[PDB]
Write a protein that binds this ligand. Structure first.
Ligand SMILES: CC(=O)O[C@@]12CO[C@@H]1C[C@H](O)[C@@]1(C)C(=O)[C@H](O)C3=C(C)[C@@H](OC(=O)[C@H](O)[C@@H](NC(=O)c4ccccc4)c4ccccc4)C[C@@](O)([C@@H](OC(=O)c4ccccc4)[C@H]21)C3(C)C
Ligand SMILES: CC(=O)O[C@@]12CO[C@@H]1C[C@H](O)[C@@]1(C)C(=O)[C@H](O)C3=C(C)[C@@H](OC(=O)[C@H](O)[C@@H](NC(=O)c4ccccc4)c4ccccc4)C[C@@](O)([C@@H](OC(=O)c4ccccc4)[C@H]21)C3(C)C
Ligand SMILES: *[C@@H]1O[C@H](CO)[C@@H](O[C@@H]2O[C@H](CO)[C@@H](O[C@H]3O[C@H](CO)[C@@H](O)[C@H](O)[C@@H]3O)[C@H](O)[C@H]2NC(C)=O)[C@H](O)[C@H]1NC(C)=O
Ligand SMILES: *[C@@H]1O[C@H](CO)[C@@H](O[C@@H]2O[C@H](CO)[C@@H](O)[C@H](O)[C@H]2NC(C)=O)[C@H](O)[C@H]1NC(C)=O
Ligand SMILES: CC(=O)N[C@@H]1[C@@H](O)[C@H](O)[C@@H](CO)O[C@H]1O
Ligand SMILES: CC(=O)N[C@@H]1[C@@H](O)[C@H](O)[C@@H](CO)O[C@H]1O
Ligand SMILES: *[C@@H]1O[C@H](CO)[C@@H](O)[C@H](O)[C@H]1NC(C)=O
Ligand SMILES: *[C@@H]1O[C@H](CO)[C@@H](O)[C@H](O)[C@H]1NC(C)=O
Ligand SMILES: *[C@@H]1O[C@H](CO)[C@@H](O)[C@H](O)[C@H]1NC(C)=O
Ligand SMILES: *[C@@H]1O[C@H](CO)[C@@H](O)[C@H](O)[C@H]1NC(C)=O
Ligand SMILES: OC[C@H]1O[C@H](O)[C@@H](O)[C@@H](O)[C@@H]1O
Ligand SMILES: OC[C@H]1O[C@H](O)[C@@H](O)[C@@H](O)[C@@H]1O
Ligand SMILES: OC[C@H]1O[C@H](O)[C@@H](O)[C@@H](O)[C@@H]1O
Ligand SMILES: OC[C@H]1O[C@H](O)[C@@H](O)[C@@H](O)[C@@H]1O
Ligand SMILES: OC[C@H]1O[C@H](O)[C@@H](O)[C@@H](O)[C@@H]1O
Ligand SMILES: OC[C@H]1O[C@H](O)[C@@H](O)[C@@H](O)[C@@H]1O
Ligand SMILES: OC[C@H]1O[C@H](O)[C@@H](O)[C@@H](O)[C@@H]1O
Ligand SMILES: OC[C@H]1O[C@H](O)[C@@H](O)[C@@H](O)[C@@H]1O
Ligand SMILES: OC[C@H]1O[C@H](O)[C@@H](O)[C@@H](O)[C@@H]1O
Lengths: 401, 401
């Protein structure tokens, strides 16, 4: 559960979250409730259910990295627990909205009087095939169209195996909040509702880039060919995800390492401490990785320096903050920046400050010599940037060894 | 909730209830979960959903006498809460088992390993039409065929507006328990699960007769005609329900006033006390029903005697018991017996005894005189009978005024 509550990521919030004590709650989407055939209906690999089946809350993906469930704690059941505590009413349409007789009529009638409308969306994928685009699973496009027609307070919650296309509605003023919650396992619903009701502020951030379009990603991501010897050439090199997005100058929807809270954090007092170094003595096994500065005592993974910064909860509510550190290694055709540290502060009171610390190892500031076939620390001007996301970096400094 | 717990009526138990702490639980039937269109989707009179809609748990009937619901505490959600406390697993097939791709296979894969299989059945009906027969609503017949195919520990729970036909399954030894929970309103699951698990023994009993066949009841119960002036001739007279079965020598599957407990009760010490009479002063308003014994100072509703009996809990668990009193009023063309009292003893411990008391009013022992146009107490022998149902009557005596 605590994993779910720490992961769930807030992408948009025009004022609707956290919920106070809404009296009339509307829920949309089979994602909000059980698989109609049972949590384990899809079998040993969570891939045997029909393509149109209502599989319910998307708690894991398809294939060999799935597992059986003792139960699922559905969002609806958890939302209901909370409604009942508030002496409120709650109603869910969980059928296929396109194919079920009266579904659309029901939604039209249910939503206008709701204080808030949740829409649960999912996007299953699996081992054995690739997603054909950023397409919402089942009836999700429809759900969303209906929802914004009849309600001005839609809160979208996505259970997905990756980025999905929400371009149609993400800038609709009627969509007041959007959250992704990934694949939260069995404690799906009870990990989420605390966040929505504001018992714990959301603290999770995107572990990849949310581009406005599949066309903004590394070309030829999937090659389709009947050719007896199929060929993908990684001609983009090191430039995947936000590295690609950064180098090409492409603004995504939501950047790598982005995710809102219910409060704001102000960054301050950047500090690089050259005296804060230490030898790697802890790791279980060692590589035979070659590097310039090697002298028979030392390591690629020695922490050469350490960098510090200060966050201040400048908001109105307690909240956790994932601080990120990026470095610009100099060189030719070198990423605009690369993440070389993160430190999550837990539950920072309003007005309070905490120090963020980042141990930079040697390898963290090195390049591969193609010619000499070793790791070496380049010369040049290293940019160090610290902040909230891969594009929210209010503190830079420069280092030159 | 409490009305639900006090009402649910146990019709069969081969040994499977109460549940201890089963580790693997299977659930069958859309009646186990929510209306897929929302609890109030059927609208202002619970009647506007499509004839095949999966309306979920039948918490009330259709028509002017229905009402909106602020939520539904589904059987599935209530059973799951117990599952979780027992560190167990629970899975529900709640689709239409005859029309949903995969449903039947999923049922076949799930049941054989389950420690217990619950099937939730329903039978909607509404103002404006009569049931065409006793058949189960939706896919209930199919669920019951499937269940007894793949599981030897099937427990059946019926949400219904009246008697249904379960003659195919009720004497199948794979059906280990059968309960009817009628129409429990918004607290459907949390009322039922305490009874199954044995936090409270079941104490409800049937408020009508449950015949093997619709053919066993009063003939011409629903007249179907296009005649301009349709006629229903009540030639049966007072002989409806158990009066019909009793007089005509027909054996029901479960008689009027039948319901099992998790313990047994022995009856003793029938006492008819002619000294224990009382004048009627408690009515809010009075009738002007003529009666023969009227002396200006008395009333058809005076209690004229009181009968007592004793019940003892002769089993091994605490139970509540509804004790019933019937009187054979003598005369031409008279019901074999007529209910004239009931008394529910609450939570009688093992070994303990309690006294059951039954005030008998003058009207309770009277007949109407067509010739004289007044009520009178006939001459002859009155048989007074006491017991646990209309056919389980261990105690009797004759009163001859
Ligand atoms: C083919 C394959 O990927 O097999 C394995 C078995 O170990 C492999 C690794 C894989 O992790 C594993 C266990 C999985 O967990 C997958 O999620 C998984 C799959 C990806 C899936 O794979 C497929 O559907 C195959 O492409 C499919 N193959 C073909 O039909 C095929 C024919 C000609 C050319 C190429 C392919 C297949 C389907 C059903 C039974 C056997 C093979 C089979 C498989 O049943 C599962 O496979 C079997 O259970 C199985 C395979 C062969 C014989 C008997 C059983 C699958 C599941 C569980 C559904
Ligand atoms: C016919 C009837 O019972 O009407 C009422 C309106 O007050 C009546 C009392 C009744 O208890 C009440 C409120 C109900 O709650 C019923 O559950 C109820 C019904 C039984 C239902 O009525 C029927 O099914 C009638 O048999 C049905 N009969 C006919 O269509 C019919 C027409 C001409 C000649 C012969 C028969 C009907 C349907 C729809 C509108 C009017 C009549 C209408 C009705 O909308 C509901 O009716 C209306 O809402 C309504 C009726 C007439 C005009 C406008 C609205 C119904 C509901 C709520 C669905
Ligand atoms: C509910 O879960 C189902 C898995 O148990 C899922 O079905 C599977 O969906 C994928 C698409 O994500 C299908 O993928 C394949 O589609 C055709 C196969 O002929 C190929 O062109 C593709 O390359 C791809 O491999 C699976 O076929 C499908 N599995 C089955 C057995 O039908 C449902 O889609 C899920 N429901 C929803 C609404 O998301
Ligand atoms: C679900 O509820 C609906 C009513 O809201 C039921 O459909 C009615 O069923 C009766 C028969 O009992 C028909 O006379 C009506 O025409 C039906 N209503 C409409 C508008 O179609 C439906 O049968 C219930 N579901 C199940 C499976 O019993
Ligand atoms: C001849 C006649 O009036 N009989 C009607 C019948 O036509 C109608 O289908 C049914 C339900 O509407 O109600 C019956 O009373
Ligand atoms: C006239 C009458 O009802 N007699 C019954 C008798 O049939 C029954 O065997 C006995 C014990 O229950 O109680 C008395
Ligand atoms: C927003 O919702 C309202 C109903 O509350 C609807 O009238 C309006 O068309 C919607 N607008 C957009 C931009 O979807
Ligand atoms: C991609 O691979 C094909 C297959 O050998 C090759 O002909 C083509 O020139 C390659 N292009 C690159 C590496 O950019
Ligand atoms: C009862 O269940 C078993 C499987 O558990 C099945 O093989 C058997 O045929 C069933 N018997 C009846 C009478 O349905
Ligand atoms: C119903 O009763 C009337 C009056 O006795 C009678 O004329 C009519 O035939 C009866 N209908 C029957 C016999 O079902
Ligand atoms: O980096 C040195 C050299 O290594 C090799 C090739 O990939 C060249 O493109 C590159 O410039
Ligand atoms: O590109 C130069 C590089 O290519 C080849 C390797 O085996 C190296 O020894 C050499 O230095
Ligand atoms: O062509 C020789 C080969 O080794 C040298 C490098 O600089 C590479 O650019 C190249 O792959
Ligand atoms: O730098 C040139 C490079 O050539 C090749 C190898 O012998 C390497 O060890 C050497 O470093
Ligand atoms: O082992 C390192 C390896 O690097 C490459 C070449 O430079 C070779 O000379 C050498 O074998
Ligand atoms: O049977 C008489 C009448 O009852 C109801 C219908 O479902 C049919 O059974 C028929 O119109
Ligand atoms: O119209 C079909 C059906 O309607 C009502 O249920 C009655 O009037 C039936 O006798 C008739 O069969
Ligand atoms: O009750 C007396 C007398 O009343 C009238 C009819 O119902 C007769 O059948 C009956 O015998
Ligand atoms: O005609 C006589 C008439 O009144 C007298 C009673 O016995 C009734 O049964 C009957 O109907």
């Amino acid at each position: 559960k605590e994993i779910g509550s720490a992961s769930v990521t807030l992408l948009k919030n025009t004022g609707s979250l956290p919920l106070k004590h809404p009296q009339r709650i509307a829920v949309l989407g089979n994602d909000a409730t059980y698989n109609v055939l049972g949590p384990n209906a899809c079998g040993l690999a969570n891939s045997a259910c029909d393509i149109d089946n209502l599989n319910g809350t998307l708690t894991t993906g398809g294939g060999s990295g799935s597992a059986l469930s003792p139960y699922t704690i559905t969002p609806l059941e958890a939302l209901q627990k909370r409604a009942i505590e508030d002496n409120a009413e709650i109603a869910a349409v969980v059928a296929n909205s396109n194919t079920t007789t009266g579904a659309e009529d029901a939604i039209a009638a249910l939503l206008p009087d709701a204080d808030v409308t949740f829409v649960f969306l999912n996007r299953y994928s699996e081992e054995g095939a690739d997603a054909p685009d950023f397409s919402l699973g089942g009836d999700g496009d429809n759900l969303m169209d209906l929802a914004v027609t009849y309600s001005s307070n839609v809160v979208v919650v996505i259970h997905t195996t990756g980025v999905v296309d929400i371009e149609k509605w993400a800038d609709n003023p009627n969509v007041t909040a959007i959250l992704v919650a990934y694949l939260p396992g069995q404690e799906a619903g009870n990990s989420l509702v605390p966040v929505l009701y504001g018992d714990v502020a959301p603290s999770g951030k995107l572990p990849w880039t949310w581009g406005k379009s599949i066309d903004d990603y590394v070309p030829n991501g999937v090659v389709y060919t009947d050719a007896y010897s199929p060929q993908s050439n990684f001609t983009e090199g090191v430039f995947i995800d936000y590295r690609w997005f950064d180098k090409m100058g492409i603004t995504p929807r939501y950047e790598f390492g982005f995710g809102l809270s219910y409060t704001t954090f102000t960054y301050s007092n950047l500090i690089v401490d050259h005296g804060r170094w230490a030898k790697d003595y802890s790791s279980v096994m060692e590589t035979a990785e070659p590097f310039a500065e090697w002298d028979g005592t030392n390591s690629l993974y020695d922490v050469i320096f350490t960098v510090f910064a200060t966050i201040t909860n400048t908001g109105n509510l307690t909240g956790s903050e994932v601080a990120q550190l990026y470095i610009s290694i100099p060189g030719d055709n070198q990423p605009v920046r690369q993440l070389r540290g993160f430190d999550k502060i837990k539950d920072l009171p309003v007005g309070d400050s905490a120090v963020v610390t980042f141990p930079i190892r040697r390898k963290d500031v090195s390049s591969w010599s193609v010619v000499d076939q070793l790791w070496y620390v380049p010369n040049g001007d290293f940019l160090i940037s610290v902040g909230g996301s891969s594009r929210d970096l209010p503190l830079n400094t420069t280092w030159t060894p």
